[PDB]
Amino acid sequence: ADCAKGKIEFSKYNEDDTFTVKVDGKEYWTSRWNLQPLLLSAQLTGMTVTIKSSTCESGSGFAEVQFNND
Amino acid sequence: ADCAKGKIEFSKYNEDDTFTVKVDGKEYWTSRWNLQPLLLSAQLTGMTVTIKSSTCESGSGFAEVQFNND
Amino acid sequence: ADCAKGKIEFSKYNEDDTFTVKVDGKEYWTSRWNLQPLLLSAQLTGMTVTIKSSTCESGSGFAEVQFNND
Amino acid sequence: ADCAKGKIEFSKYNEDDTFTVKVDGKEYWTSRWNLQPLLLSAQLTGMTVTIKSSTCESGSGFAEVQFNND
Amino acid sequence: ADCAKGKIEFSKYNEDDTFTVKVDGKEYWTSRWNLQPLLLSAQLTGMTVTIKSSTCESGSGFAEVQFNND
Ligand SMILES: O=C[C@H](O)[C@@H](O)[C@H](O)CO
């Protein structure tokens, strides 16, 4: 389901090789290695991201995310 | 066969590590890793892509795509 | 041997995970995975590339290229 | 620990295959190859970065970094 | 030592997977495949780069490089 739709206000490369983004005032992270360069490209180029997940509370893991232009 | 032609409406990183793009009203996906950064960049810059595949209805897989600045 | 000098008219991710470019009306492929985001960038920014190989016919494999800002 | 917040002043690919960045007048290195294209991306677009690590002297190793677009 | 300081005039993916750049009249090559996308980016954007090496004569190899903005 759709956890968070907005820009990335920040992203963070973590010690455990995971990647966090803050979207709509909610941090989420992912262990999808290959997602990384993609998220940072979204951030850098002001894309709207939709973070899609089973569990949507601030701090959970994710592996699905849509990229929209806007 | 030329399935779709146009800009990427949106893209989506999928839970099974496949990558989906929407072109001329239809959704297609790839499981070629190397394809993701490539599709993203294309969307970012408004490239015109031609998805080429075996079947062309929405939901189809593809491993072939032409990039134009068209 | 300089097979084709110019700008990339279009680029293609092949079914067989190789990469095709078209330059001064002739098409070339590389199996060099490394070269993809590179070729893609040169197209995006309209660089002059010089493709190089021992055999200069259309749909020949190549493994060397010069990226210029010409 | 927030070791340094600012813009990346320069970056350097090291002989030993680590990667250094200068932020708020201090040098930090990382061995996470994955950070390299992100950090160069952040520099070119003058994002503000926060280097995070256990220890903060100049010439320390780090693997945690926040990317602000702000 | 510092071999050359300036913008990249051209770059070249060699057959052997090495990557050659030309800076201030002098060619150098690296076999660090991670350097490739970083060096193409610096060329596209016109960063000043510093090739650091044990031997500075044109045509020699390097495994260290610094990027600066503008
Ligand atoms: O062999 C490594 C795997 O390919 C892994 O990197 C996945 O891509 C994680 O998303």
Residue numbers in the entry:
A (entry chain A), B (entry chain G), C (entry chain H), D (entry chain J), E (entry chain I): 1 to 70
Task: Cite, word for word, the article reporting this structure.
The pathogenesis of E. coli O157:H7 is in large part due to the production of Shiga toxin (Stx), an AB5 toxin that consists of a ribosomal RNA-cleaving A-subunit surrounded by a pentamer of receptor-binding B subunits. There are two major isoforms, Stx1 and Stx2, which differ dramatically in potency despite having 57% sequence identity. The B-pentamer binds to the glycolipid globotriaosylceramide (Gb3) on the surface of host cells and delivers the A-subunit into the cell. Analytical ultracentrifugation using purified B-subunits demonstrates that Stx2B, the more deadly isoform, shows decreased pentamer stability compared to Stx1B (EC50 = 2.3 µM vs. EC50 = 0.043 µM for Stx1B).
Examination of the structures for potentially destabilizing amino acids in the inter-B-subunit interface revealed a notable difference at position 40 of Stx2B, which corresponds to amino acid 41 in Stx1B. Gln40 in Stx2B lies in an otherwise hydrophobic pocket and closely approaches Leu38 (inset). To test the role of L41/Q40 in B-pentamer stability, we generated the reciprocal point mutants Stx1B-L41Q and Stx2B-Q40L. In contrast, the reciprocal mutant Stx2B-Q40L stabilized the inter-B-subunit interaction to the extent that the pentameric species predominated in sedimentation velocity experiments down to 0.5 µM, the detection limit of the absorbance optics. EC50 values, calculated from the K5 values, were 0.043 and 0.106 µM for Stx1B and Stx2B-Q40L, respectively. CD measurements of the ellipticity at 219 nm as a function of temperature revealed that the Q40L mutation raised the Tm of Stx2B by 18°C relative to wild-type Stx2B, whereas the reciprocal mutation L41Q in Stx1B lowered the Tm by at least 15°C relative to wild-type Stx1B (the unfolding transition for Stx1B was not completed by 95°C and thus could not be determined precisely). X-ray crystallographic studies of Stx2B-Q40L were undertaken to gain better insight into molecular packing at the inter-B-subunit interface. As expected based on the CD data, no global structural changes were observed in an overlay of the Cα traces of a single B-subunit of wild-type Stx2B and Stx2B-Q40L (average RMSD  = 0.37 Å). The leucine in the mutant packs well into the hydrophobic pocket of the adjacent subunit, whereas the wild-type glutamine residue appears to be offset from the groove. This confirmed the CD data indicating that the change in solution behavior was not due to any large-scale structural changes, but rather the destabilizing effect of the unfavorable presence of the polar side-chain of Q40 in an otherwise hydrophobic pocket.
